[PDB]
Amino acid sequence: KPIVFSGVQPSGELTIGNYLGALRNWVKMQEDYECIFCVVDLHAITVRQDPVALRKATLDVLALYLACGIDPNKSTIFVQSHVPEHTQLSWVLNCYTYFGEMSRMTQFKDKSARYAENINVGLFDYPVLMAADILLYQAKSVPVGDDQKQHLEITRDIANRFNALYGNIFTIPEIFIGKAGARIMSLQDPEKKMSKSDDNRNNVVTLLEDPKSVAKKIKRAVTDSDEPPVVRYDVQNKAGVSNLLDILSAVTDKPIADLEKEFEGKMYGHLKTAVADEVSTLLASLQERFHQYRNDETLLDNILRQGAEKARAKAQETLAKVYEAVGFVAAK
Amino acid sequence: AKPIVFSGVQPSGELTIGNYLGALRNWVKMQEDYECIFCVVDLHAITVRQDPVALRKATLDVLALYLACGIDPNKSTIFVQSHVPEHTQLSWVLNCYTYFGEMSRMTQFKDKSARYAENINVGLFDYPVLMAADILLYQAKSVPVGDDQKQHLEITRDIANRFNALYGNIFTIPEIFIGGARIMSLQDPEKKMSKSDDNRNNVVTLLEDPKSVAKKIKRAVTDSDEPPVVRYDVQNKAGVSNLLDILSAVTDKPIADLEKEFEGKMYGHLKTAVADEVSTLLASLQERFHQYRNDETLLDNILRQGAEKARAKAQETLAKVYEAVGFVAAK
Ligand SMILES: N[C@@H](Cc1c[nH]c2ccccc12)C(=O)O
Numbered sequence: 001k002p003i004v005f006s007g008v009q010p011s012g013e014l015t016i017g018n019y020l021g022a023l024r025n026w027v028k029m030q031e032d033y034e035c036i037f038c039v040v041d042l043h044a045i046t047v048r049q050d051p052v053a054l055r056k057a058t059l060d061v062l063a064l065y066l067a068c069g070i071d072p073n074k075s076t077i078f079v080q081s082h083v084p085e086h087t088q089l090s091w092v093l094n095c096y097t098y099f100g101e102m103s104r105m106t107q108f109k110d111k112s113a114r115y116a117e118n119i120n121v122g123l124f125d126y127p128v129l130m131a132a133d134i135l136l137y138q139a140k141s142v143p144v145g146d147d148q149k150q151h152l153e154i155t156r157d158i159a160n161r162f163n164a165l166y167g168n169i170f171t172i173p174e175i176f177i178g179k180a181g182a183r184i185m186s187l188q189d190p191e192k193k194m195s196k197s198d199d200n201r202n203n204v205v206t207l208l209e210d211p212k213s214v215a216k217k218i219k220r221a222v223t224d225s226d227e228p229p230v231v232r233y234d235v236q237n238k239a240g241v242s243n244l245l246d247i248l249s250a251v252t253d254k255p256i257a258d259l260e261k262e263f264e265g266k267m268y269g270h271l272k273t274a275v276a277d278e279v280s281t282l283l284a285s286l287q288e289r290f291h292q293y294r295n296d297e298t299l300l301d302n303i304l305r306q307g308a309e310k311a312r313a314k315a316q317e318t319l320a321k322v323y324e325a326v327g328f329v330a331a332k
Numbered sequence: 333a334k335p336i337v338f339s340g341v342q343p344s345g346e347l348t349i350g351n352y353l354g355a356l357r358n359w360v361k362m363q364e365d366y367e368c369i370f371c372v373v374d375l376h377a378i379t380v381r382q383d384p385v386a387l388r389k390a391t392l393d394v395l396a397l398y399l400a401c402g403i404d405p406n407k408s409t410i411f412v413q414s415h416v417p418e419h420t421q422l423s424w425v426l427n428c429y430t431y432f433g434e435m436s437r438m439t440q441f442k443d444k445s446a447r448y449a450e451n452i453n454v455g456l457f458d459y460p461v462l463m464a465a466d467i468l469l470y471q472a473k474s475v476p477v478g479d480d481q482k483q484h485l486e487i488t489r490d491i492a493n494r495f496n497a498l499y500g501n502i503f504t505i506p507e508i509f510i511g512g513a514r515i516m517s518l519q520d521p522e523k524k525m526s527k528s529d530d531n532r533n534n535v536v537t538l539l540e541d542p543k544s545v546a547k548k549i550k551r552a553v554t555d556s557d558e559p560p561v562v563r564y565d566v567q568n569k570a571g572v573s574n575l576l577d578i579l580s581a582v583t584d585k586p587i588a589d590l591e592k593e594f595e596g597k598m599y600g601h602l603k604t605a606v607a608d609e610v611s612t613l614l615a616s617l618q619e620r621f622h623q624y625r626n627d628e629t630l631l632d633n634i635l636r637q638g639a640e641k642a643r644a645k646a647q648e649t650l651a652k653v654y655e656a657v658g659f660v661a662a663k
């Protein structure tokens with residue numbers, strides 16, 4: 001089974017876009033791939049975090065993934081900080097990474113502009129730890145957002161460079177191109193994809209979001225001023241209404257054309273009620289499962305222990321080979 | 333309640349009598365009054381390109397030299413840096429509380445950046461943060477550092493103070509170690525004896541044959557005073573003063589008592605005594621060196637003991653660091 005590695009930032013402010021697009025897909029990949037889900041708490045502290053909230057958010061993202069159907073008997077799920085080998089590899093890789101390769105990074109330049117009060121070394125060295133996270137597990141494939149591509153490319157360059165000196169120690173990872181799921185746009189900026197990080201909170205629906213809160217957000221979803229109003233799919237002219245239909249289709253599994261028939265002669269209000277009703281049905285189901293997981297702290301600690309254990313065994317195979325190659329005395 | 337002193341030891345098979353009579357013989361003695369921690373810094377070694385076979389050799393050579401000199405694994409903690417994962421774990425967290433500008437303005441980085449320009453690696457930039465982690469992990473009160481490493485100790489202190497300010501008194505704030513002879517080069521006695529000198533006649537290494545020793549001592553530069561006199565005067569009689577320093581440090585005889593012993597005698601007598609005393613010392617060190625260095629099982633057990641102790645200490649601090657910043661504790 002091919003190994004797929006994914007880094008997961010701590011939050012549990014996953015949207016219906018994270019779920020309908022990617023997570024639902026991940027759940028099904030479990031059967032045919034060896035999936036590895038790493039909650040990246042070490043990367044999280046590259047920006048100042050409230051400690052109590054980081055701890056809560058780490059557990060929230062874990063329980064959310066479990067609620068969505070990621071199964072720790074089929075996937076390896078763990079917390080980055082529970083596996084020392086991540087940082088151990090990153091130090092070795094820092095030594096084989098050019099300074100100029102980190103300073104040329106788009107992400108470093110952008111986060112430096114946004115957080116000029118905390119331009120730390122962690123922020124600069126982010127990509128090497130990311131490289132280490134992937135290379136430790138000999139991953140063949142890694143899904144990354146468009147913003148994280150330069151990071152996956154530098155990972156490949158470091159691995160090839162190290163392999164050119166010492167032999168084929170690392171698998172050169174490739175971008176994972178998904179089955180692809182629901183196209184889910186921002187509710188007030190249909191031209192942009194709904195995003196975890198967005199400042200305007202009317203753009204997103206969160207997985208843990210309340211039914212009356214969902215209803216408000218959908219109520220104020222941007223729609224065109226066509227007169228009369230008509231519920232028809234047209235991304236060019238009716239991005240607002242088309243998104244609502246993509247959401248409805250995704251959740252109900254009803255073809256878009258059938259939804260058009262259903263809403264012939266209805267107002268945008270009717271379409272918005274259906275979308276809120278159907279999204280809140282899905283979310284009620286997710287949330288009930290989340291609440292079971294999140295409140296069973298003994299279960300969560302056991303899942304994390306099992307997962308870190310599995311992760312450490314695999315990571316150690318790679319790291320030992322690295323440590324042998326560069327010339328370290330092996331611990332006995 | 334013994335105060336903790338932390339020293340980073342670069343892998344090397346080439347220590348000299350200047351190393352031994354300067355710092356090392358004193359570290360051996362202070363094992364009684366201090367909690368001494370000796371970390372062989374193999375992770376720092378690879379910030380510059382290393383021969384793997386030579387790195388592995390130099391790691392075990394330096395450990396066996398330390399043991400030979402008297403560093404005792406039941407009294408001190410002696411270990412290989414790469415054997416203790418907590419060093420890299422802490423250094424990541426410290427990166428997140430260390431400003432880019434702080435590393436940018438290190439003198440060592442600027443010098444190397446002018447020399448190597450675009451060829452420099454991230455390791456050389458970040459070296460001081462791992463060094464800070466090395467020290468802070470063990471709650472070290474004192475650290476001996478060279479002049480060229482003073483800036484690295486200052487930034488360690490800044491980082492630790494900063495972290496404490498945010499999260500409470502987690503780190504001890506390290507200070508420079510306070511309180512052997514300054515052994516000079518045999519053919520250029522204004523220069524300190526350096527293990528990495530290209531003139532091998534400048535140096536006596538610890539693993540040197542006693543006939544090679546007599547050769548180098550006989551050839552040591554003196555002066556052309558008329559009359560020649562065995563008298564201590566670093567300015568005017570550097571070479572003779574240096575032989576007197578060697579002899580004094582090796583025998584524990586004060587310089588004034590040696591001056592008396594060599595009253596009316598010649599430089600040749602002084603050189604004979606220095607050669608005889610140094611070769612006696614090195615014989616005894618060499619024998620111990622070969623006993624430990626050839627005994628792989630023993631070296632494995634000593635490194636394992638060392639790493640088990642270092643990990644136990646390191647974890648106390650690292651657990652508090654990981655809790656403070658907000659991580660879920662492994663269970
Ligand atoms: N940088 C990723 C998170 C991440 C860390 N390590 C990774 C390794 C593989 C994929 C993703 C990651 C993000 O911004 O979300």
Ligand SMILES: N[C@@H](Cc1c[nH]c2ccccc12)C(=O)O
Binds near residue numbers: 341342373462463475
């Ligand atoms: N930088 C030191 C080696 C070292 C690494 N970590 C240390 C901690 C304390 C003292 C020295 C060190 C040297 O060049 O010699």
